């Protein structure tokens, strides 16, 4: 037996906010910024350049057609909250 799917890594560097996904690189990976899917965005790392507390904030879902565990991720500032 092996260990499953880990959890998100939110790194922030002034202008930008990086988003290391819990999954693998897979290429077939889908990124979803709250219902609305992300246009051909595919690596485990998402760089939300010049982040806005209204525009770039929200619910995030990284999923492959494998780990459809559909593991959310909240944002703005306090990640994984109400």
């Amino acid at each position: 037996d092996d260990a499953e799917n880990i959890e998100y890594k939110v790194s922030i560097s002034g202008t930008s906010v990086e988003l290391t996904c819990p999954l693998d690189s897979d290429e077939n990976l889908k990124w979803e910024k709250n219902g609305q899917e992300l246009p051909q965005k595919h690596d485990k790392h998402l760089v939300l350049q010049d982040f806005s507390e209204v525009e770039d904030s929200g619910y995030y879902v990284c999923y492959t057609p494998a780990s459809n565990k559909n593991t959310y991720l909240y944002l703005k500032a306090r990640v994984s909250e109400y």
Epitope: S25, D26, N28, P65, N68
Partner: antibody, heavy 116, light 108 residues
Framework: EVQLVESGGGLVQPGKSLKLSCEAS????????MHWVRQAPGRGLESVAY????????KYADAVKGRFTVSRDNAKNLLFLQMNILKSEDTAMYYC?????????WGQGTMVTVSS | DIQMTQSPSSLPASLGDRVTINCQAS??????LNWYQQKPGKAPKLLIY???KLADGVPSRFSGSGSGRDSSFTISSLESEDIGSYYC?????????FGPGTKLEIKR
């Protein structure tokens, strides 16, 4: 264009061993999660194992969980299935596959038969 | 680990008629359901992905329907080449649980 080739199946006696080896062609295999699927005659279709692009997460179907072990070589674009302690349940045809969201890549498959 | 119910497991039908196949899972699959056309010895072709969504170069007539814990599939008007096994499969969790296997029998 996106050709896949399952290699080395055939007969085996019970509780033995077998290494199945798919070959990728026409894609960035290196960074694509892969599946191993079987069609157990009569009994129908079954998913066997899944291994991520970087081999970080491996997922097995309950029936084989244990005795079977998927692996990959991203240089020679090879997907291997390491079946051991074989049963008559494990008597099926095996295909290796790339499962996209809209696409589906299956190989020709190799027929594995387990009888004493 | 989910489970699929296909009804019927033999559908003898005349040509060019509303052929309907039904799929049913244990718990919710949330539309992550596929349909396939396995003809003769070799590999199953994908027809419909995410239930509603029709795949690339699949005849207009084929219609993937049903949601939640259930689903269906419908060849609008069964043509000559559509003869062979049909499978539903789910993609909500690994292992992908596969359907039994409906076989299309051409009524002559």
């Amino acid at each position: 264009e996106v050709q896949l080739v399952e290699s080395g199946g055939g007969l085996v006696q019970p509780g033995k061993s077998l290494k199945l080896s798919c070959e990728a062609s026409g894609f960035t295999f290196s960074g694509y999660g892969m599946h191993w699927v079987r069609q157990a005659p009569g009994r129908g279709l079954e998913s066997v194992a899944y291994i991520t692009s970087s081999s970080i997460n491996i997922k097995y179907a309950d029936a084989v969980k244990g005795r079977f072990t998927v692996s990959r070589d991203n240089a020679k674009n090879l997907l291997f299935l390491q079946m051991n302690i074989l049963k008559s349940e494990d008597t099926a045809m095996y295909y290796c596959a790339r499962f996209d969201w809209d696409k589906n890549y299956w190989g020709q498959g190799t027929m594995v038969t387990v009888s004493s | 680990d989910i489970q699929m119910t296909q009804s019927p497991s033999s559908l003898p039908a005349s040509l060019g008629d509303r052929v309907t196949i039904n799929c049913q899972a244990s718990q919710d699959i949330s539309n992550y359901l596929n349909w396939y056309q396995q003809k003769p010895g070799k590999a199953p072709k994908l027809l419909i992905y995410y239930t509603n969504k029709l795949a690339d170069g699949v005849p207009s007539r084929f219609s993937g329907s049903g949601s939640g814990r259930d689903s269906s599939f419908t060849i609008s008007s069964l043509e000559s080449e559509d003869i062979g096994s049909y499978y539903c499969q789910q993609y909500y969790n690994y292992p992908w649980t596969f359907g039994p296997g409906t076989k299309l029998e051409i009524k002559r």
